[PDB]
Design a protein around this ligand. Structure first.
Ligand SMILES: [Zn+2]
Lengths: 101, 145, 141, 206, 67, 80, 69, 55, 63, 143
RNA sequence: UAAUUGCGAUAACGAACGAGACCUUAACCUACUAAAUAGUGGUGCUAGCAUUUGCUGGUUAUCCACUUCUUAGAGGGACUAUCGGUUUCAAGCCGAUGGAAGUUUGAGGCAAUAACAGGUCUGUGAUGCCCUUAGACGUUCUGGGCCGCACGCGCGCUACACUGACGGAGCCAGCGAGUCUAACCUUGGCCGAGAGGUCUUGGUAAUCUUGUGAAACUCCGUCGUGCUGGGGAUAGAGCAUUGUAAUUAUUGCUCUUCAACGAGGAAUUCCUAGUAAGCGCAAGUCAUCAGCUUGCGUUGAUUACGUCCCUGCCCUUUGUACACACC
C-alpha cells in the first residue's frame, strides 16, 4: 500500500481531458480516498520572430504559441493495482510520469 | 530657529586657492566652484573639517578656511580613503594625490604629453583632436569650433 | 458562531478580499486602521462608503481587508469596492431588504459604479509601434 | 451630532462634516448657482464630489464629458505638457491648494469662483475657415455651449502654464490669481485677453 | 455597425416561415426553440438567429411583411 | 535497441491525401507527362475520389525563360 | 541677485509687513520683498513657531498661511 | 608608420576643416534600374511555340 | 448690448468644407413662431441655449 | 486599548524611533558613515548626517517586524533606487550592501533581530517588545 | 453599413469565394468538479502590548472545514436587450433604463481574384546556367577591418528645469525565464564605499530565485530662478567582471573635468479611451555588452463621433491610334 503521485502533461487538451477522466474513473471504482485532479496554470511558450526571410518589406512580426497543460493525481494503492493503472491507461502525446514520492 | 543675526563679518566673493570663490552661495557648492574639486569631495571635506554645513560662505571665516585648505592639500593623513581622490598609483611614485585649481590642468596636460612621448595611439588621437575614447566619428562630433 | 462573509474588489490588477463579521464595529486594511492608508489624498476615497452609509450601520461589524496586486491607486479602488460589496453582502444575508435596497439606491446615486468592476482593460501592444495604437514615425525620403 | 467611537479612531472633523453634507474636503457643494444662462446643463456642479480622482468613463459616447463634474475637468486640463502627462494625484493636490488660495484671497466659495471664471471667459464668437479662392477668407461663427466651457478651461490652464514656466510663483498661486482675474475680468487674465482678441477678430471678420 | 448578414437573415426568415405557431415573443424562449429545432453549430450565431427572429416577430405581430 | 518499433499502414482514403497527390505529380512530371495533362489527372482524381475541393498550383519555368503559374481549380474551397 | 541674510532691516520690515497682505507663502514673500527663498522659509518657520500668522496647510512644496485673525 | 603618422603635417582635424566639401557628399541617388524596369534588358523575347510547347 | 439667448429645435446638417459647422434651427426663447437658421462651430444637441450678438445674418453653405 | 506598529503611522513612528535610538546611542556605527552614498544609484551623500544611519535602523526594524524573514539582498532591493546612467535611461540598482549589513548586525548586537532558519533574519521578542512600547508612546503622544 | 453590409428599386432569380461566421485571448460567474505545487477561517504550542476576551505574528505537514479571492475543464452569459424617437417606415441610427459588458464587447490569427520584372541565389544538401576548383573564389590558422572621418539624411535616448532637481521615509505590479552526463537563475551568510568576490542553499520548476519589495509615484526636508544643486557631453586616473586575448575606452564602479541646449525655422509623423503620453520590468540575439525590438504591467488625459478641403485608394460615366497596356 504505497502512496504515489502521477503527473500528466501534454499539448493536446481534449486527449489530456479524457486521459484524466479515465484515471479518475478507475480510481473511483477502486476508491482510494477520492483525489480529484488539480489543475496547474497553462504554460504559454511564446516565440516571437520576423515574418520576412530577408530584411526587406514592412517590419511585421509573428508570435507562435505552444500551450503546455499539466495535471497531477495522487493514488494510495497496492503494487499490482498501480501497475494495472499505469500500463492500461495510455494514449499518444500525453506524457505521464509516475513517482513513488 | 536657524536665523543668523550677524551684521558685519559677512563678506562678498572671496579668495581660496587661485580661484574666485562666490561669497553668497553654500560652502559645499562654493568649494565645487573651486576648480579641481567637485560636490561629494566638497561635502566630505566640510563634514570632516567640522565646518558648519548649514550656511553660506560669509562666516566659515579664516581659521576653518585654513583647516579646509590643509585638508585639501593633504587628504591622506586624516582618514580620507585612497579611492576618494582623483589620481592614484600615479606615474612614477605611486603615492596618492589630489590635483587642485591649476595643477589639475597642468597635470592632465602632463600625462597627455607623457603618452604623446611614448607615441601611443591615444597620443596620436589627442594630437589630431579627434575622439580619444572609442566612439563613432562617422555621424557625431560635427562643428567642433 | 462567527457570522462572517467574504467579498472581493477588483481594479485593473488589484484584488482585495474583505472578511466581514458581526463584532464591535472596527474597519481595517492590511492589519492597519483605514485612517492610515498612504496615498494621503484618497483618504476621503476610502472614507466614501462609510460616509455614504452612516456610522451606525458600521457600528456592529468588523471588516478586515487583505490586498494583493496592482499599483497604489488600484489598491485604494479595490479597497473601496471590496468594503462597499462587503456591506451590501452582509446586509443582504443578515438584515432587511429595504435596508439593503436603500443602500443600493444611495450607492448607485453617488456611484463611481462603487460595486461593479471597471471593465476597462489594457489592450495588447502591436508590432511596429511602442504603443497599443501608436506606430513608429516614417520619413518618406 | 451623535458620534460613534470605535476601536479604530475615525476623527471627528471628517466624521461630522461628511456625515452632515457631502462636501469637497471641507467645502459646500450647495448654495452655488450659475450666475449666467446659456451654460447650464454642462457646467456640472449639482452633484457633489469629495476628491476629483474618479475612474469615470467619459470619452465613450458623445457628451459624458459634459455630464462630468467640472473640477475633474480642471484637474485633467491642468495635467498637460509632457513633464506631467500622468500625474493627476499631484494635479488634485495642486487643485486643492488652488482652492485654499482662493479662500484666503476672497471669502466666497471656490467652486463659485471656478464657475464665474468659466462664465466670464467662454468665447462667445469664434471664427471658422472657408476655402475662398485667394486669401482663404475666414467667417465668424457662434459657439456651442460645451465648446464654450471646453475652450474656457483650456484658456485658464494654458494661461497658468505660460505665466508659471520659469518663475518663483508656483502653479497653485498662478492658477489662483488667473481664476480671480477671470472671475472679475480686469483685462489682466490671459483667458479673458484671449477671449477679447477672439471677439475682436470675429467682429472684424463678420 | 450592427448590420445583420445574409446567413442570419436567411435562416431567420426560413424559421419564421415554417415555425410561426410554436415561436414566442421572447428572446430566451425563442433561442431555446432555435437550439431544439435547428442543428446550428455556433453559439453566437445561434443568439444572432434568435435576435433577428424576435425582431421580425415583433414586426409580424404589429403588421404584415413584404418578405 | 528495442525501444522504438516501426509499423506500416495502407492509408485509408489514399485519394484524399495532399502529400500523396504531390508525390504522384512529382512522379508524373519526372516521367515526362505534360503539365496540363497530368495536373488535370490529379484534379479529376481528387474530385472523383470524393473530396469537396481541389487545386494545383504548379509554378516555375518549363520551356520559356519567363515563369508563370497556371492554377487548376475544381470544386469548392474555403480560404480563411 | 537677492539678499539671503537678515541684516535686521529686512527683519523689522517682515515684522511690519505681516499685516499688509493676507496670503502668506514663499513666493509671496519673495516677490513682496527681495529675500532669496531659503531665508523666507526660515522666516516662515519662525513665524509658525510664534504665529502672528496661522496655518491653513503645510506641504513640503508649498505652505499656505493667513493672518492670526 | 607611427612616427610618420604623428609627424605628418597634413593630418589633423584642423586641416580637414580647412579643406572644403564636395558635392558628392550631398548628391542623392541614380535610380535608373528602377526607373526603367518593365522594358526587358536581356533581349530574349519569349516566343509563341516555346510558350505553347511548354506551359 | 443686444445679447440674444437662443434655443435649438432641430439640427439641419453639418456644413463646412472641413465639415465642422453644424446648421441648426434656433428659436429665441421669446417668440415661439420667430425662428431662423444658424451656423454653429461646436457640437450641438437639441434643447440647449446659444447666444447671439448679431441675429440678422441668415447664412448658408460654406465653401 | 490595543497597540501595534501597524496601528501607528509610518512617518511619525519612524521619526520618533530615530530620536529614541539617538538618545540611547549604543549602535557602534562603522567608520565610513560619512563617505558613503547609501547606494551606487545615488550621487549625493545623505543630508542629515547625524541621524541618517539611525533612521535607517528604525526603518530596518519596522521592515523586520512587518515581514517574516528577509536578508541583505531584500534590504538592498528595497532601499535601492533609480540610477541615472547619463544619457541612457534609468535603471533599478540595489543599495549599499555594506551599510545594510552593518545596520543589520548593529540591530543584532542590540538584540532586536536574530538569525532565522531557512536563511535570513527575523524579529526578536525584546525587539518587538520595545517596538510595541514606542508604538504606544507614538499612539498616546496626543495632548 | 466597418463591409458588394443589408434594405429597397428592379430582366433578373437563386448561389459560391472574400467580409461576416470561425478560432485564440481579456472582461462576468457566491453555478458543478476539485486542490500540502494557491489561498481563507478555526482548533493546538508560543511571542509581545494591553491584559478586559482582543490585535499583530509565527508554526512543512498538530488537525479539521471551505473554494470568495488563484488555477481551468465542462458550461452559461449579449442578442443593440426593453422602451421612446426618426427613417421608404424598411435597412438601420440617436437617447434613456437594465446589465459585468451596448465602440464589429475590446484586441488579434487566418484572410478571395490576382498581379508586381517588389526583396531574398548571403537561410537551406531548393536550384538551372555560368565562373572557379590546388599559388583554390573550398576549408583552416594569425593579425587588421566591418567602429575609420571636411559633410548631408533617417529612427531614437538625455535635456533645456520648481507641473523640478537632491537626501531620507512609505510601499505597489504583470509578462516570462532558469542547470546532466554540466556550469543556468541564484536565496542566505561573510569581506568590500562600490562594482564585485568566497562558503554554501534551493529549483528541471503555481514548490526556489520571487511577493521578481521595479520605476514613475506619495510625505518630510534642502535648493530659490541663477548655464544653478538643470544638463552630464567631452575628458584624466584607479578599482573589478566576461573571455585565449579589452589596445581602436567590451562593460560596470569611484573621484575629477561641467561643453552645447533658456521650448526649437521651413516642414512633417503618430493618435479617438485604460487611448495618446509618462514610467519602468522581463524575453530575443548573449561569455560580456540595449540608448534596439518583441511583450507586460503602473500612472493615465485633451478633442471628435464628422467631412471630402488637402493627400492616397476604390467604383461609375466618359476618351484612346495603348494591350509588352503611359516605363
Ligand atoms: Zn530545408
Amino acid at each position: 500500500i504505497i502512496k504515489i503521485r502521477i503527473t500528466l502533461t501534454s499539448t493536446k487538451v481534449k486527449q489530456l481531458e479524457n486521459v484524466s477522466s479515465n484515471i479518475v474513473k478507475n480510481a473511483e471504482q477502486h476508491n482510494l480516498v477520492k483525489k480529484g485532479p488539480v489543475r496547474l496554470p497553462t504554460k504559454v511558450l511564446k516565440i516571437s520572430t520576423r515574418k520576412t526571410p530577408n530584411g526587406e518589406g514592412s517590419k511585421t512580426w509573428e508570435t507562435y504559441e505552444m500551450r503546455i497543460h499539466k495535471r497531477y493525481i495522487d493514488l494510495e494503492a497496492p503494487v499490482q493495482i498501480v501497475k494495472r493503472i499505469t500500463q492500461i491507461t495510455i494514449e499518444p502525446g500525453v506524457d505521464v510520469e509516475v513517482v513513488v514520492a | 530657529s536657524l536665523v543668523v543675526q550677524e551684521q558685519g563679518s559677512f563678506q562678498h566673493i572671496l579668495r581660496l586657492l587661485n580661484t574666485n570663490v562666490d561669497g553668497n552661495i553654500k560652502i559645499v557648492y562654493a568649494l565645487t566652484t573651486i576648480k579641481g574639486v567637485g560636490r561629494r569631495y566638497s561635502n566630505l571635506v566640510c563634514k570632516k573639517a567640522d565646518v558648519d554645513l548649514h550656511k553660506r560662505a560669509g562666516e566659515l571665516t579664516q581659521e576653518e578656511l585654513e583647516r579646509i585648505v590643509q585638508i585639501m592639500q593633504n587628504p591622506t593623513h586624516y582618514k580620507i580613503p585612497a579611492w576618494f581622490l582623483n589620481r592614484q598609483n600615479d606615474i612614477t611614485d605611486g603615492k596618492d594625490y589630489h590635483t587642485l585649481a591649476n595643477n589639475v590642468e597642468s597635470k592632465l596636460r602632463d600625462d597627455l604629453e607623457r603618452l604623446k612621448k611614448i607615441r601611443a595611439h591615444r597620443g596620436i588621437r589627442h594630437f589630431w583632436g579627434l575622439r580619444v575614447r572609442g566612439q563613432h566619428t562617422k555621424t557625431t562630433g560635427r562643428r567642433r569650433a | 458562531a462567527v457570522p462572517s462573509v467574504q467579498t472581493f474588489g477588483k481594479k485593473k490588477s488589484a484584488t482585495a478580499v474583505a472578511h466581514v463579521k458581526a463584532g464591535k464595529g472596527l474597519i481595517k486594511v492590511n492589519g492597519s486602521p483605514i485612517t492610515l492608508v498612504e496615498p494621503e489624498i484618497l483618504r476621503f476615497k476610502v472614507y466614501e462608503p462609510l460616509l455614504l452609509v452612516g456610522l451606525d450601520k458600521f457600528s456592529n461589524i468588523d471588516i478586515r481587508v487583505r490586498v494583493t496586486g496592482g499599483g497604489h491607486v488600484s489598491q485604494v479602488y479595490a479597497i473601496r469596492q471590496a468594503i462597499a460589496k462587503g456591506l451590501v453582502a452582509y446586509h443582504q444575508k443578515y438584515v432587511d431588504e429595504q435596508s439593503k435596497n436603500e443602500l443600493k439606491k444611495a450607492f448607485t446615486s453617488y456611484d463611481r459604479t462603487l460595486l461593479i468592476a471597471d471593465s476597462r482593460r489594457p489592450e495588447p501592444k502591436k508590432f511596429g509601434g511602442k504603443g497599443a495604437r501608436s506606430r513608429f514615425q516614417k520619413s518618406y525620403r | 451630532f451623535t458620534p460613534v467611537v470605535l476601536a479604530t479612531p475615525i476623527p471627528e472633523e471628517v466624521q461630522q462634516a461628511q456625515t452632515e453634507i457631502k462636501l469637497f474636503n471641507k467645502w459646500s457643494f450647495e448654495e452655488v448657482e450659475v450666475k449666467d444662462a446659456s451654460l447650464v446643463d454642462y457646467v456640472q456642479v449639482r452633484q457633489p464630489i469629495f476628491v476629483a480622482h474618479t475612474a469615470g468613463r467619459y470619452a465613450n459616447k458623445r457628451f459624458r464629458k459634459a455630464q462630468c463634474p467640472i473640477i475633474e475637468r480642471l484637474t485633467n486640463s491642468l495635467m498637460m505638457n509632457g513633464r506631467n502627462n500622468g500625474k493627476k494625484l499631484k494635479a488634485v493636490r495642486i487643485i486643492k491648494h488652488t482652492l485654499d488660495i482662493i479662500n484666503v484671497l476672497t471669502d466666497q466659495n471656490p467652486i463659485q469662483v471656478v464657475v464665474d471664471a468659466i462664465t466670464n471667459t467662454g468665447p462667445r464668437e469664434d471664427t471658422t475657415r472657408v476655402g475662398g479662392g485667394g486669401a482663404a477668407r475666414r467667417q465668424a461663427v457662434d459657439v456651442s455651449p460645451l465648446r464654450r466651457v471646453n475652450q474656457a478651461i483650456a484658456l485658464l490652464t494654458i494661461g497658468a502654464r505660460e505665466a508659471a514656466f520659469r518663475n518663483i510663483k508656483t502653479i497653485a498661486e498662478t492658477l489662483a490669481e488667473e481664476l480671480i482675474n477671470a472671475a472679475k475680468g480686469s483685462s489682466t487674465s490671459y483667458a479673458i485677453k484671449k477671449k477679447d482678441e477672439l471677439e475682436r477678430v470675429a467682429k472684424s471678420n463678420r | 455597425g450592427r448590420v445583420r448578414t445574409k446567413t442570419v437573415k436567411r435562416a431567420s426568415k426560413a424559421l419564421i416561415e415554417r415555425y410561426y405557431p410554436k415561436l414566442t415573443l421572447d428572446f430566451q424562449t425563442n433561442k431555446r426553440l432555435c437550439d431544439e429545432i435547428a442543428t446550428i453549430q455556433s453559439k453566437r450565431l445561434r443568439n444572432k438567429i434568435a435576435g433577428y427572429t424576435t425582431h421580425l416577430m415583433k414586426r409580424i405581430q404589429k403588421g404584415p411583411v413584404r418578405g | 535497441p528495442g525501444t522504438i518499433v516501426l509499423y506500416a499502414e495502407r492509408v485509408q482514403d489514399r485519394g484524399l491525401s495532399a502529400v500523396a497527390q504531390a508525390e504522384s505529380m512529382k512522379f508524373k512530371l519526372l516521367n515526362g507527362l505534360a503539365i496540363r495533362r497530368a495536373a488535370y489527372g490529379v484534379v479529376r482524381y481528387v474530385m472523383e475520389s470524393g473530396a469537396k475541393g481541389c487545386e494545383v498550383v504548379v509554378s516555375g519555368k518549363l520551356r520559356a525563360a519567363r515563369a508563370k503559374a497556371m492554377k487548376f481549380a475544381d470544386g469548392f474551397l474555403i480560404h480563411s | 541677485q537677492h539678499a539671503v541674510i537678515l541684516d535686521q532691516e529686512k527683519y523689522d520690515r517682515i515684522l511690519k509687513e505681516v499685516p499688509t497682505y493676507r496670503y502668506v507663502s514663499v513666493s509671496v514673500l519673495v516677490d513682496r520683498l527681495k529675500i532669496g527663498g531659503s531665508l523666507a522659509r526660515i522666516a516662515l518657520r519662525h513665524l509658525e513657531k510664534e504665529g502672528i500668522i496661522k496655518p491653513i496647510s503645510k506641504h513640503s512644496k508649498q505652505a499656505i498661511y493667513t493672518r492670526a485673525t | 608608420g607611427n612616427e610618420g603618422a604623428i609627424r605628418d603635417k597634413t593630418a589633423g582635424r584642423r586641416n580637414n576643416r580647412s579643406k572644403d566639401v564636395t558635392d558628392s557628399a550631398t548628391t542623392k541617388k541614380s535610380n535608373t534600374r528602377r526607373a526603367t524596369d518593365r522594358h526587358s534588358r536581356t533581349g530574349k523575347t519569349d516566343t509563341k511555340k516555346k510558350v505553347n510547347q511548354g506551359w | 448690448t443686444p445679447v440674444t439667448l437662443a434655443k435649438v429645435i432641430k439640427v439641419l446638417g453639418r456644413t463646412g468644407s472641413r465639415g465642422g459647422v453644424t446648421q441648426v434651427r434656433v428659436e429665441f426663447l421669446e417668440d415661439t413662431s420667430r425662428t431662423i437658421v444658424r451656423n454653429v462651430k461646436g457640437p450641438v444637441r437639441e434643447n440647449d441655449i446659444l447666444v447671439l450678438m448679431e441675429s440678422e445674418r441668415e447664412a448658408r453653405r460654406l465653401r | 486599548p490595543g497597540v501595534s506598529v501597524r496601528d501607528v503611522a509610518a512617518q511619525d513612528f519612524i521619526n520618533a524611533y530615530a530620536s529614541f535610538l539617538q538618545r540611547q546611542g549604543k549602535l557602534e556605527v562603522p567608520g565610513y558613515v560619512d563617505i558613503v552614498k547609501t547606494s551606487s544609484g545615488n550621487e549625493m551623500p545623505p543630508q542629515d548626517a547625524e541621524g541618517w544611519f539611525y533612521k535607517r535602523a528604525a526603518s530596518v526594524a519596522r521592515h523586520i517586524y512587518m515581514r517574516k524573514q528577509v536578508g541583505v539582498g531584500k534590504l538592498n532591493k528595497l532601499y535601492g533606487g533609480a540610477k541615472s546612467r547619463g544619457v541612457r535611461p534609468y535603471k533599478h540598482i540595489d543599495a549599499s550592501g555594506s551599510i545594510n549589513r552593518k545596520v543589520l548586525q548593529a540591530l543584532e548586537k542590540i538584540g532586536i533581530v536574530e538569525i532565522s532558519p531557512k536563511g535570513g533574519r527575523r524579529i526578536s521578542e525584546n525587539g518587538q517588545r520595545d517596538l510595541d512600547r514606542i508604538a504606544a508612546q507614538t499612539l498616546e503622544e496626543d495632548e
